[PDB]
Design a protein around this ligand. Structure first.
Ligand SMILES: *CCC(=O)Nc1cc(Nc2ncc(C(=O)OC(C)C)c(-c3cn(C)c4ccccc34)n2)c(OC)cc1N(C)CCN(C)C
Length: 266
């Protein structure tokens, strides 16, 4: 379906402010002004490094993602470089959000985020799509009660500390290895943005995983919640929970939020 992806001219969008920078490229805050519309849509713009060699085929797939908890590719600008246009999420990423609001985040917010992230991942799995880079930094906040998974499709700088053990050792990526990354993302949220395995070099992560060591229990987590994270990090990938079951588990817990998370002043 070609029309779901808009091909933009360079005159249609302007870059206003830098939001983040890395080896991938740069993400800008900008404005999209389609020619005959007289509207100014706030957008985020990611300019990829020059190719030196297909990604339009992946762009159409990213444009067809149709779920309230996964970011959709709004448009693409094809020159020597490739620039991706998406809706601006005005509250930033969930990683920065839980760090800045570490004092006043209730259990209902946290468990609802876990549900929405699982809903987005379950949608991707039903489309037979693997994300490969699920992390708290890659969950964006449209509104505090509405989050979206971003950066889907960029895979087609290794995020070792979020990867399943079989991804580190065998470079095997499946939906069950996404579940492992989901467990680390939830651990990031429950610790209000702590760095996983802080201090340990990335070259030693596969070793400590092989010895049975996992991320510690967050203090606000009852054992009921922590055992869900623990099951996401089982070596046998098929034993890990499925995103379908994670939606059901966290939905039941979001109905009685104080029973499952112990937060000061909740
Ligand atoms: C976790 C770091 C972060 O995301 N910081 C951030 C994010 C945003 N909002 C926003 N909106 C859309 C997109 C996006 O879809 O980009 C696609 C790839 C075009 C992004 C975004 C996505 N990736 C992969 C990023 C990497 C780095 C930076 C942003 C993105 N982000 C805003 O909007 C204001 C700000 C923001 N920073 C400045 C943090 C806000 N401070 C107030 C903390």
């Amino acid at each position: 379906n070609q029309a779901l992806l808009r091909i933009l001219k360079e005159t249609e969008f302007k870059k206003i402010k830098v939001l983040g920078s890395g080896a991938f490229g740069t993400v800008y805050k900008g404005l999209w002004i389609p020619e005959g519309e007289k509207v100014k849509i706030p957008v985020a713009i990611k300019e990829l490094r020059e190719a030196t060699s297909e990604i339009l085929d992946e762009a159409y797939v990213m444009a067809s993602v149709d779920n309230p908890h996964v970011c959709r590719l709004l448009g693409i600008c094809l020159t020597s470089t490739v620039q991706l246009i998406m809706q601006l999420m005005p509250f930033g990423c969930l990683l920065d959000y839980v760090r800045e609001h570490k004092d006043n985040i209730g259990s209902q917010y946290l468990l609802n985020w876990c549900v929405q992230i699982a809903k987005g991942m379950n949608y991707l799995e039903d489309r037979r799509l693997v994300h490969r880079d699920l992390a708290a930094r890659n969950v964006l906040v449209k509104t505090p009660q509405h989050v979206k998974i971003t950066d889907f499709g960029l895979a087609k700088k290794v995020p070792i500390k979020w990867m399943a053990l079989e991804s580190i050792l065998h470079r095997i990526y499946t939906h069950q290895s996404d579940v492992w990354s989901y467990g680390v993302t939830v651990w990031e949220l429950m610790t209000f943005g702590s760095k996983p395995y802080d201090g340990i070099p990335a070259s030693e992560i596969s070793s400590i995983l092989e010895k049975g060591e996992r991320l510690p229990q967050p203090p606000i987590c009852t054992i009921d919640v922590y055992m869900i994270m623990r099951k996401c990090w089982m070596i046998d990938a098929d034993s890990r929970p499925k995103f379908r079951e994670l939606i059901i588990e966290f939905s039941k817990m979001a109905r009685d939020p104080q029973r499952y998370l112990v937060i000061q002043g909740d």
